[PDB]
């Protein structure tokens, strides 16, 4: 905790707070990116932030697209995740490293938000549940 901030929008919190928690935590970590230092942001369950944003947009009666999601649910996560950069030397040289966490359902990377974040991010760390009980922990496929 001498180096970690925690931004916690829990399940009982309102859906706009769960929507805005990754953006607020990215704003807190962009301080370290922008002033020369180095950041590590971890959006644990960006799936649940996506579900909260879908809630707010269906309740605002914006037109739903695939699975119920809005049109700009890709723009949501890409606008969030492109703030993880390594800056140039004339901007301090600082950096911010994102680890979004996406829960899959029975291990398909063909789900809509999972495909969106796979399209956005650089790599992936795919943890397989079959490898989990074979003793292999971390269960990295």
């Amino acid at each position: 905790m001498r180096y970690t901030i925690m931004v916690s929008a829990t399940a009982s919190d309102a859906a706009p707070l769960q929507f805005l928690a990754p953006y607020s935590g990215c704003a807190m970590a962009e301080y370290f990116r922008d002033t020369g230092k180095h950041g590590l942001i971890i959006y644990d369950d960006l799936s649940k932030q996506s579900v909260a944003y879908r809630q707010m947009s269906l309740l605002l009666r914006r037109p739903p697209g695939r699975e119920a999601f809005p049109g700009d649910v890709f723009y949501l996560h890409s606008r969030l995740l492109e703030r993880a950069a390594k800056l140039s030397k004339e901007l301090g040289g600082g950096s911010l490293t994102a680890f979004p966490v996406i829960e899959t359902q029975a291990g398909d990377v063909s789900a809509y938000i999972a495909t969106n974040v796979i399209s956005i991010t650089d790599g992936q760390i795919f943890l397989e549940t079959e490898l989990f009980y074979k003793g292999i922990r971390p269960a990295l496929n």
């Binding site: 002033t35 020369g36 230092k37 914006r62 037109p63 697209g65 695939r66 809005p70 049109g71 700009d72 890709f74 723009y75 890409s78 606008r79 492109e82 703030r83 950069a85 390594k86 063909s110 809509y112 495909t115 399209s119 956005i120 650089d122």
Partner: protein, 538 residues
């Protein structure tokens, strides 16, 4: 002359009391943080137009003045855009001054009509052996690039740029539709490093115009950036008279962006999830890539296949427009063959004897049959034995093993980090070279003779050097002196030569920091608009 009425996400309604702007016209929101361009999508009635923003709409007030430009989005075109990076609306994002515009062209355009089209259907010689022989490029056609990461896709992009500018004297546009900014910056610096983009006073000698619509841009900006690259390419076609290359990086992201702007305008999605206008929103882009009577645009579009499903409607609609595929393989690249074009999974519509002639067609089909014949016995060699089957089967093994080497080729933009000079290979030399290996005129030359060389009068010089290298081996010996005390010290000496770096427990962080004081009270605006505490009664 018009004012903002609704702001719902990236979708802005503007109201005009005078006359309305046309659909696809560009509107400037007067008074904002950044330049906010809207593009008119429909006339809703009651003097309202429905627009789709090219930047963020956060910070937009109902009643904000909006100026109609009287035209669609207009971008700078010409030779002054070469070596520059533009966004969708034409602003320079490479931070190197303005853009020296020859003209300012509308990005919205009808396709070149029937009388202007070319009926010739000829081949674009690219100087790459595996591309010219097995999967040729139509001059004016669309080519799907099934590459990825680590298969040398960017080197192939820069070599198509380099060889087309070198041979046919045409320029290139790269439309980075929805690319990540790390990948776009990597391609920018790799183009500066390889000499196809030059900065400063040598800027006119650049071969490529980058048009970047990044992934953090709104869906309206990613949906239109391919049209901006098209307009830059169409100026070189229609005014300069060139054979242009356009690179639509991830045509699937163009599809996905137009699907997002169709979903945001409240249209019912068609099959699997796509826009109802998917075929026409794709064909509006792809039909402007053609051969006119002036010049041509040849488009190399990277294709992503959504769930490894070729019957998905976005690749099934894209593959109707494609004239060739060049599949880049990891297994080809792990045999050290560069470029990593899969010689058997790459196709071309230009591969039939009515456009390339029976000579080129039969050489390509013989090469492809020989590599296929080697491909379906590798489960017979690895199972039963290498020298197990016939000599004729091992003749096809040796011939396809040296043709599989011969498809590799050193690249001219790769020489600044590989040293090996790149070699442009002409088409007739490629035909006459692979015909000789196919008949068996080079069955005596080694397999490493056919490796990273231009044409058939270089595999001979490769073997000549390899057999002069036999006589250069008895010049010395092999030995490694001083088994335990040449340079390997005591481990205490090795830890007493590494220098201690300075570590402090005051981490700092108060270097150029404001440290404002944040109020705990909630501060609102009164009806006059001044910052006031909350009136403390519900």
């Amino acid at each position: 002359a018009g004012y903002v009425s609704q702001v719902i996400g990236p979708v802005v309604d503007v109201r005009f009391d005078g006359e309305l702007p046309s659909i696809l016209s560009s509107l400037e929101v007067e008074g904002h943080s950044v330049r906010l361009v809207l593009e008119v999508a429909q006339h809703m009635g009651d003097n309202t137009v429905r627009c789709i923003a090219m930047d963020s709409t956060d910070g937009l007030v109902r009643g904000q003045k909006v100026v109609d430009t009287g035209s669609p989005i207009k971008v700078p075109v010409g030779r002054g855009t070469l070596g520059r990076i533009m966004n969708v609306i034409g602003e320079p994002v490479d931070e190197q001054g303005p853009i020296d515009a020859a003209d300012i062209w509308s990005i919205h355009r009808e396709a070149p009509e029937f009388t202007e089209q070319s009926t010739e259907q000829e081949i674009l010689v690219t100087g790459i052996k595996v591309v010219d022989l097995l999967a040729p490029y139509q001059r004016g056609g669309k080519i799907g690039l099934f590459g990825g990461a680590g298969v040398g896709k960017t080197v192939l992009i820069m070599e198509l740029i380099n060889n087309v500018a070198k041979a046919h004297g045409g320029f290139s546009v790269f439309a980075g539709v929805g690319e990540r900014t790390r990948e776009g910056n990597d391609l920018y610096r790799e183009m500066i490093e390889s000499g196809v983009i030059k900065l400063g006073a040598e800027r006119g000698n650049s071969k490529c115009t980058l048009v970047y619509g990044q992934m953090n841009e709104p869906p309206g900006a990613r949906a239109r950036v391919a049209l901006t690259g098209l307009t830059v390419a169409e100026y070189f076609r229609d005014i300069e008279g060139q054979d242009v290359l356009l690179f639509v990086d991830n045509i699937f992201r163009f599809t996905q962006a137009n699907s997002e702007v169709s979903a945001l305008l409240g249209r019912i999605p068609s099959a699997v999830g796509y826009q109802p206008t998917l075929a026409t929103d794709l064909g509006g882009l792809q039909e402007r890539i053609t051969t006119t009577t002036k010049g041509s645009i040849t488009s190399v579009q990277a294709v992503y296949v959504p769930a490894d499903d070729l019957t998905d409607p976005a690749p099934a609609t894209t593959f109707a427009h494609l004239d060739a595929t060049t599949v880049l393989s990891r297994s080809i690249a792990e045999l050290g063959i560069y470029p990593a074009v899969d010689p058997l999974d790459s196709t071309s519509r230009m591969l039939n004897p009515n456009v390339i002639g029976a000579e080129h067609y039969n050489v390509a089909r013989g090469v492809q049959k020989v590599l296929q014949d080697y491909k379906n016995l590798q489960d017979i060699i690895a199972i039963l034995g290498m020298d197990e089957l016939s000599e004729e089967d091992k003749l096809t093994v040796a011939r396809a093993r040296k043709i599989q080497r011969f498809l590799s080729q050193p690249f001219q933009v790769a020489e600044v980090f590989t040293g090996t000079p790149g070699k442009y290979v002409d088409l007739a030399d490629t035909i006459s070279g692979f015909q000789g290996v196919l008949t068996g005129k080079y069955d005596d030359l080694p397999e490493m003779a056919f490796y990273m060389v231009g044409d058939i009068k270089e595999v001979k010089e490769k073997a000549d050097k390899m057999a002069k290298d036999i006589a250069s081996r008895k010049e010395a010996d092999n030995k490694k002196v001083s088994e335990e005390l040449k340079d390997i010290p005591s481990l205490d000496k090795l830890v007493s030569e590494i220098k201690e770096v300075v570590i402090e427990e005051d981490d700092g962080l108060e270097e150029d920091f404001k440290a404002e004081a944040l109020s705990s009270e909630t501060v609102v605006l009164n009806e006059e608009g001044k910052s006031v505490p909350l009136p403390k009664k519900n």
